[PDB]
């Protein structure tokens, strides 16, 4: 209840941590630990009736975010773990079910079968990109194919539970919490050309409500970097 | 020199051997290891996780997220079937493309038990009851709620808990996992009555596979 980091404070009341391991620290990489370790609340998305899903590429949603974004232009390298708090707040008269899954190395697929998607289309900075429940056509050149039953990666979307995940059932549950360690092949990588995590929120059972209730429900994502450090002097 | 004598099957290439081989690049000083999280030592750890079962195919929901949702509504006749699916393997069943059933298509003989978890994603104010019938191999599919009750079953009160587990065995009539309305869905005013159920499947941790082959999911 009412946890705080730096100059921010959020409140909480069930956590699922990564692949079982907890994030920790390692020329010489220096340790900045107090200046940017805080809760970065992104803006809320609206869960409507015929909504399809959302995604965020994770070391890119915190690129225009304050002093964390200032520490990226000053540093060529870095390695960072995360802690993600997702909560949506509806009444007891709404009903639905969300899957909050955190995918490492999620290559997206382009709509044209020869090309590859562009950086403006793969990831909106600190802004959610949307799945669709129709097909993106082949005629446009560089756009992400977002048929949500394939999850944009050419796979069964029901089998996405092999990644570290959490269900949000409005009947019983209210929030989700993930703690994701640093997963990469190299120990310290180029932070400008690599988005090594992807946070997806997909409504399996759609939102429903009776006439009179509030016709859409907000979802609030909060990311807090754990064990961030960069390389330089 | 030392007298040797070469036997049959000497200068042959058997593709399934294990022999020492001369290294093309010695003196390279290979890159050391690194602790990356999430190591897989066996394929049965991939099968032990829960995955959503597309139990609502119906030829127009397969290109949707509606394939995973079982429709539940408050009708007027007491005693009806919600869903039902056989446990016959391979012949286009519903546990086929799931994350368990993708490993068991790489082998020819496998035999064990299955967890089946159901989750009621309806309102918090809706109540009701369900029967969860399992017919063993040899016994027919039940055609009433009554003779479904006379077999093995679980009565699932939705208002108490929102998740019910049912464990069956699955070996390479072979079974049925039908489910029935015991009572209707009682709902207050200003609450919707059309609710859905999701179904998860897993491996019940204790089984084995033999004789690896290649998957039928390719051109």
């Amino acid at each position: 209840r009412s946890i705080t980091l730096g100059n921010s404070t959020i409140t909480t009341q069930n956590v699922v941590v990564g692949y079982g391991v907890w994030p920790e620290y390692l020329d010489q990489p220096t340790q900045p630990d107090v200046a940017t370790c805080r809760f970065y609340t992104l803006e809320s998305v609206q869960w409507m009736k015929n909504s399809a899903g959302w995604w965020w590429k994770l070391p890119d949603a915190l690129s225009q975010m304050g002093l964390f974004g200032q520490n990226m232009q000053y540093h060529y390298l870095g390695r960072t773990g995360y802690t993600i708090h997702v909560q949506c707040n509806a009444s007891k008269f709404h009903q639905g079910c969300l899957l909050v899954v955190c995918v490492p190395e999620a290559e997206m697929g382009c709509s044209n079968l020869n090309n590859t998607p562009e950086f403006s289309e793969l990831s909106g900075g600190d802004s959610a990109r949307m799945f669709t429940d129709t097909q993106v056509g082949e005629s446009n050149a560089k756009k992400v194919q977002t048929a949500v039953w394939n999850a944009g990666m050419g796979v069964g979307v029901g089998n996405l539970t092999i990644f570290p995940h959490q269900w949000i059932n409005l009947r019983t549950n209210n929030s989700a919490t993930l703690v994701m360690p640093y997963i990469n092949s190299v120990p310290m990588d180029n932070m400008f050309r690599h988005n090594n995590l992807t946070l997806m929120i997909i409504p399996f059972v759609p939102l429903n409500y009776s006439e009179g209730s509030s016709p859409y429900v907000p979802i609030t994502v909060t990311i807090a970097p754990m064990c961030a450090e960069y390389n330089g002097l | 020199g030392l007298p040797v004598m070469t036997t049959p099957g000497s200068t042959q290439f058997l593709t399934s051997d294990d022999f020492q081989s001369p290294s093309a690049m010695p003196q390279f000083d290979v890159t050391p290891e690194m602790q990356i999280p999430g190591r897989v030592n066996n394929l049965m750890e991939i099968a032990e996780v829960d995955s959503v079962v597309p139990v609502n195919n119906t030829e127009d929901n397969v290109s949707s997220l509606k394939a995973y949702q079982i429709p539940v509504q408050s009708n007027s006749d007491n005693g009806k079937q919600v869903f039902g699916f056989p446990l016959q393997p391979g012949a286009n069943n519903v546990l086929n493309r799931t994350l368990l059933g993708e490993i068991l298509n790489y082998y020819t003989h496998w035999s064990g038990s299955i967890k089946l978890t159901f989750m009621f994603c309806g309102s918090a104010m809706a109540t009701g009851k369900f029967l969860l019938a399992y017919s063993p191999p040899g016994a027919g599919v039940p055609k009433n709620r009554k003779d479904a009750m006379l077999g093995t079953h679980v009565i699932w009160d939705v208002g108490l808990q929102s998740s019910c587990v049912l464990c069956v065995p699955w070996i390479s009539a072979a079974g049925y996992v039908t489910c029935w309305y015991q009572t209707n869905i009682v709902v207050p005013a200003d609450v919707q009555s059309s609710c859905d159920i999701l179904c998860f499947v897993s491996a019940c941790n204790d089984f084995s596979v033999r004789m690896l082959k290649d998957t039928p999911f390719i051109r």
Partner: antibody
Amino acid sequence: EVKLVESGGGLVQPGGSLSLSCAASGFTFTDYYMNWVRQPSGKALEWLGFLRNKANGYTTEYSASVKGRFTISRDNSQSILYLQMNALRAEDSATYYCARSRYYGGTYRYALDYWGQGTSVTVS
Amino acid sequence: NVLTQSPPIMSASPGEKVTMTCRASSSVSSSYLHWYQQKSGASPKLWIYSTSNLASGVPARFSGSGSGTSYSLTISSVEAEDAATYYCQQFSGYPLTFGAGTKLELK
């Protein structure tokens, strides 16, 4: 009741521009897909494009024949659907309809349930 | 993916059964094939959606069928007020292609 009227057609020199407009009343505008279909004099129909609802982000999907020339949009104030036609040719002389789609299960079948009365566009 | 309708011109007296077919070039799914009806000097109307389901306000004389790459539409009893043109729509990829048109004139 559902009522889709539209307006804006007329005469145009080939190589010019024209803007059609579809006025929608009788339903919530931000919840359905809205299409654009043309038909020449006594020929088959031809689908030009649609525009998805608010929950899918108002993205557009043009046909391969008119991609780059035409533009579908909407007005954020009132329930008016637009069609900016640019670089008109000799074979664009047709009757332009305005259609709507809905979800039948929870799925999106690609049908067009309600149609507009049709404005006529011809070139000279 | 183009659709061919046959016959183009169809004539039949009222009271009998007549049918038309719409054969696709490739495989189209059963849920993405629809039938429309356009009278002379009027906009089209959705008639049958997803190859078997009657729309709203349509009389029960019609029933669509077919699967794979061959689809059809049957009229059990022909009246006088349902003489129009009938088109079939599909979706395999983009774009949404229509039929050629089947004109029904009463005899």
